[PDB]
Design a protein around this ligand. Structure first.
Ligand SMILES: Cc1ncc(C[n+]2csc(CCOP(=O)(O)OP(=O)(O)O)c2C)c(N)n1
Ligand SMILES: Cc1ncc(C[n+]2csc(CCOP(=O)(O)OP(=O)(O)O)c2C)c(N)n1
Ligand SMILES: [K+]
Ligand SMILES: [K+]
Ligand SMILES: [K+]
Ligand SMILES: [K+]
Ligand SMILES: [Mn+2]
Ligand SMILES: [Mn+2]
Lengths: 335, 391, 391, 335
């Protein structure tokens, strides 16, 4: 285990996959137009995210499509164009690339290019994301940076069951095509109290989960759990006070919150599973450098996956674990 | 013994025999009137009233008049790009005439005639090509990327074939809403080679959608002849492979195009089933204004033209004459030149429209880029074409 | 009057008639021996010599023995993933046996039998599933992503259907080099729904490539039945649409599979033309080890199995007996357990192999990441599974 | 005109499209296995880059494919897998996305995942790139950043006819799948002396085209011409000495050259046509900040296209022209 996991009315203990089902359930219940589709969602999905939904809402609302990702997204854009709510599932984030053209050239630019005569705002694409210990090259990817360079779409990644359900309900209700990445490693690990009725968590808002004064640590998805522990290590072994932030929304991202934090701490460490070169940490880093130049006491640190494909047997040495983040933090604290 | 396989319904065969494709003798071409405008089979005559047939004729010739004018405009650098509809005017009006006014249309870029038949204003066709203040598209796309929410014509985009699976999703949503509506999707034979065509055809059949796929096969995809595009019996022959009802029609015969479309709309809506119509035609003009078609290739313009053929039809009925032809030619030209001059004189949209509609709302970081530009222009404004844009 | 359109070769038709797909009565299924191992039509009997038919039988059962062992291993968490070949052993060996040893093979993930027939060592199948030091793949991919340069079996990758247009390019290069070589490409009926299948089939026909497309239609793509995968007459019916010679065979009859493959290789190479073989079969086991197939669905394992059917065939010829069956079962098991134990005991590759082969050479910035790790392990090494990896 | 353009044996005046034809000609002449294919290349290509090649080398080596980008790349990978040289053309860089899956999941990872048992190193993909004054959304794109995040491929962009021919011959001969982006606006504008026989320009090497001491300006493609003029403006109006660098290779990029330059000048301005968020300038910026923290005298500046799709009529206000770069340089020089 490379990580350790840790108001709205009645709640219920739910792991991440269950909180997704709860969100999809609330959506279909309150939106007669909403439909859910993709490869294998009818019997409940290969990660159980759609269990029971077809029996409860009907086969015309929860159905299997032929095995073709570019088709699934194009089909979804079509449904959204008529104003109906379309929640498409891509089985693994690793297999979203065949639909890249429909996402970047079509969905993201649909409203702009038409002068707002047409749009596919009611479209949401959810997909399992991140490493799982043994997924190798095509069952471990974190493609958020490929999409960060695309004006027109939103990319959102939760760190837990409570966060997932609220962020997904906002994605589904947002008036812009959204991509929701679900850390598959948490589907069955992460379990916590989750309101059974609908609630929302806003998009483009980072969350400071722990206040600090010496350094700012930023991550998203499962990686937020890693830096939380790194913060604890820093305190216990270095007397260092860490401010831990969950980015939550990749784009448009919460620039203000991060800057305000770095203006106070003066030090920043950004961490993510995806490869370093071109990863989203670059965007965050160069931006902070431009807004907080005078407050920065040391070079901004990026602890990421190496610039190689995601390996099978070498996973343990590839990921930017707590020891790797800790060491970089250490060196940065000593700059 | 009987075959038990879940993937197919068939009988066993005891001798090895490869299935041979029928290309020399392909799916026949449905025709209603000959090249001289004569109805060939009285029982296939649509018997469209005079007013409607004249509307068909006038929409085609009007489109043609607009094409000539806008093509020259492009040659003079007045507009930056253009694509004519020569030789395909019949596939547009004949199919549009067969649709209900609210049937949603997805197209490629050579379907302006569908809009013309739907009474899209000449002022708007031109507003879009000039990207002026009257363009509801706000001057953001290249010329001829038309769209109209009021006439149910989804905004055209450059990437080939992407609209195909989109049209299928739209038809699926239509089916659920239980409207008496069909979706129609146009595309060329070249575009049919993209992965998205295969995606759309297959989802349409397996998800039982009320959609009409309309392929204009004009023999070329820019400079590529069909011999290098596919080896089967055209596009029509692929429909049955997806379990899709298909037909091929003479694209220069508005009545054959109309009959096929009318019958496919009728069944697609009632049976929630897709139909494939392949219209054989010939690309008369250049691919676009950035192409000189006489680098890779008069019979189709003088001896087998949709406009010319409908003309003979009108004459035989006593519905049109040389004088009316002259008056209409003159009035067409005037209407087009009026819209053209008004279009050239209008200013372009306010540079601020460059930032809206990226998302529904405008993100804070995007507004800061907008302010950035506004400040930049305060100071270096003299170096930008500010006088031509609205304020 | 004669149709002049460049896009198709056909005659005119005067009555409106939609082409109807033939699904109830699809392309028949080619069969050579019945479910009891009896040859149905003497003129279709391949008359393969005894040694070769036994090699077919032993490769199938050996694969089966390896599958049972590796499937349990996965259940115990000894290997992280696995996919069996139950019910499809016949399509593998029958088609492989029909190929020349140097014909290049592209596959999906349920084709290990092609490698088995090509004498791929048990030690290598297992080296790859364990990702140990003997894996030429250097432990980088998930289990069952086999590959062998020496046996012309292109390394398997997870993304469905990507190998299809790749196989076509390989066949095109083969044609130019003028080798007497055909390329064969395997894929499931689900994968056939991807855009890449349409791309590969079409490029193969228009570019005239010596390639055999081999679709294993087993009724399911994980939990999706074929009724939700397509609506046409399976995959076989799409071939003619691309102008591709096609045939359907009983996938549980190694002789029908062998005859169809042998004849397609022969013609594909001589005519530089593609062939499509759709083998009807049934997925006996779970989709994989992360799937419980009894959530969305014994006839195919006990009354229509490729191994069982070849067994009866051998008995009728006096080529196999219950005793030989027992001895082979025991020897198979021993061979598999020897390779299995050697595989579990070998250490994993050196962690440095995580950085090589990204590019042919290693970029300077990539070597710095490698040094970074080496320093990191100098200091925090106690927290990593270093003892299990080679040094 | 938003820009102004400016040893190896016998040379000849060639514009950019002609220098591409010369490179393709030398390659086919010296590599019997090499073939060229894509949409419309037989009659010479829509930008005339393949004129005469089919007549000179045969229809089996220079041919048209069906209209399918994912097919063209997959087909190319196949040819390369047998060891033959495959030069695929994608008509507009805007239309490369349908082949994204074949590029990122297949081509880039081909050698790694197989343990080097197989590879598609002899594959090159060339594609027109960049704005052209009126190309709007799908005839103006600069997709280099989408590919910068993909370990396994090389992305190369030339600034002129001489640079194009030498960089293309290296791409074609490199043992790694390469993407070569040709600034379409220069095809017929940029004209200069070009060796008629083959020569190479190395990959991953930036080129300092003008030495300076107050600031480092980095760009690639047509944009190099813009900063060259900006450097001249800086000198004439601010007495500022600019060091102008052409990156040339997006990945793997020449980190050393840029850092060495910034260590000396202490100021950096990076410019590119593509949208700011997630563009490659981020990677360059965060990296320089990490290697030259102590030398940086002012925040690193990024002058890029806005975070919107590429517009038709508003192009003049969208691009990061010389006035925009000049102003940012001015403010940075005054930090
Ligand atoms: C994905 C994509 N690839 C390539 C192009 C460039 N392109 C524009 S039109 C065209 C020809 C399309 O031919 P066809 O579909 O037959 O239609 P026609 O122009 O003959 O009506 C091509 C290749 C594009 N717009 N989109
Ligand atoms: C592009 C892509 N999408 C989805 C998947 C997930 N997936 C792995 S196997 C599979 C089923 C494929 O079925 P089929 O092609 O019929 O082969 P079978 O397993 O039945 O032999 C799916 C959807 C994938 N690997 N790649
Ligand atoms: K949404
Ligand atoms: K389109
Ligand atoms: K594959
Ligand atoms: K190369
Ligand atoms: Mn065409
Ligand atoms: Mn299957």
């Amino acid at each position: 285990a490379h990580f350790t996991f840790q108001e709205y009315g009645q709640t219920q203990k739910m792991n991440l996959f269950q909180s997704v089902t709860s969100a999809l359930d609330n959506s279909l219940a309150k939106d007669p137009t909403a439909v859910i589709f993709g490869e294998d969602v009818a019997f409940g999905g290969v990660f159980r995210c759609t269990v029971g939904l077809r029996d409860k809402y009907g086969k015309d609302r929860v159905f299997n499509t032929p095995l073709c990702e570019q088709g699934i997204v194009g089909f979804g854009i079509g449904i959204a164009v008529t104003g109906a709510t379309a929640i498409a599932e891509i089985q693994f984030a690793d297999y979203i690339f065949p639909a890249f053209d429909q996402i970047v050239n079509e969905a993201a630019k649909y409203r702009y290019r038409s002068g707002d005569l047409f749009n596919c705002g009611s479209l949401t694409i959810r997909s399992p994301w991140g490493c799982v210990g043994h997924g190798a090259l095509y069952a471990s990817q974190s493609p958020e940076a490929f999409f960060a360079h695309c004006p027109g779409i939103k990319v959102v990644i939760p760190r837990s069951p409570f966060q997932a359900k609220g962020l997904l309900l906002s994605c589904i209700e947002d008036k812009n095509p959204c991509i929701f990445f679900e850390p598959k490693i948490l589907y069955r690990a992460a379990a916590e109290e989750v309101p059974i009725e609908p609630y929302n968590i806003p998009l483009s808002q980072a969350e400071v989960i722990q206040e600090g004064s010496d350094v700012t640590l930023v991550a998203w998805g499962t990686q937020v759990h890693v830096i939380r522990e790194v913060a604890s290590m820093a305190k216990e072994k270095l007397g260092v006070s860490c401010e831990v932030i969950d980015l939550r929304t990749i784009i448009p991202w919460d620039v203000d919150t991060i800057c305000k934090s770095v203006i106070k701490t003066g030090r920043l460490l950004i961490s993510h599973e995806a490869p370093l070169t071109g990863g989203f940490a670059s965007e965050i880093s160069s931006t902070v450098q431009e807004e907080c130049f005078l407050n920065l006491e040391a070079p901004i640190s990026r602890v990421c996956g190496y610039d190689t494909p995601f390996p099978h047997i070498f996973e343990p040495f590839y990921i930017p674990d707590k020891w790797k983040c800790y060491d970089a933090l250490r060196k940065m604290i000593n700059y | 013994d009987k075959p038990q396989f879940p993937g197919a319904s068939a009988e066993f065969i005891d001798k090895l025999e490869f299935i041979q494709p029928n290309v020399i003798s392909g799916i026949p071409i449905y025709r209603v009137m000959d090249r001289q405008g004569q109805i060939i089979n009285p029982s296939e005559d649509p018997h469209l009233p005079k007013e409607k047939v004249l509307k068909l004729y006038k929409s085609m010739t009007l489109l043609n008049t607009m094409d000539r004018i806008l093509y020259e405009s492009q040659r003079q650098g007045r507009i930056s790009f253009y694509m004519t509809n020569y030789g395909e005017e019949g596939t547009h009006v004949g199919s549009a005439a067969a649709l209900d006014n609210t049937d949603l249309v997805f197209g490629q870029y050579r379907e302006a005639g569908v809009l013309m038949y739907r009474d899209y204003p000449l002022e708007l066709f031109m507003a879009q090509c000039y990207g002026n203040i009257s363009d509801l598209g706000k001057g953001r796309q290249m010329p001829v990327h038309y769209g109209c929410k009021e006439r149910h014509f989804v905004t055209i985009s450059s990437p080939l074939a992407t609209q195909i699976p989109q049209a299928v999703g739209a038809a699926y949503a239509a089916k659920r809403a239980n409207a008496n509506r069909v979706v129609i999707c146009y595309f060329g034979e070249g575009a049919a080679s993209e992965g998205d065509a295969h995606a759309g055809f297959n989802f349409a059949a397996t998800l039982e959608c009320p959609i009409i796929f309309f392929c204009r096969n004009n023999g070329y995809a820019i400079s590529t002849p069909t011999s290098e595009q596919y080896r089967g019996d055209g596009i029509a022959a692929r429909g049955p492979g997806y379990g899709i009802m298909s037909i091929r029609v003479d694209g220069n015969d508005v009545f054959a195009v109309y009959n096929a479309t009318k019958e496919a709309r009728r069944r697609a809506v009632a049976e929630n089933q897709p139909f494939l119509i392949e219209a054989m035609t010939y690309r008369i003009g250049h691919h676009s204004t950035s192409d000189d078609s006489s680098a890779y290739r008069n019979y189709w313009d003088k001896q087998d033209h949709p406009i010319s053929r409908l003309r003979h039809y009108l004459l035989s009925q006593g519905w049109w004459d040389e004088e009316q032809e002259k008056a209409w030619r003159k009035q067409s030209r005037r209407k087009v030149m009026e819209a053209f001059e008004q279009a050239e004189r209008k200013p372009k949209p306010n540079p601020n429209l460059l930032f809206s509609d990226v998302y529904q709302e405008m993100p804070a970081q995007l507004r800061k880029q907008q302010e950035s530009l506004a400040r930049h222009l305060q100071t270096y404004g003299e170096h930008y074409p500010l006088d031509h844009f609205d304020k």
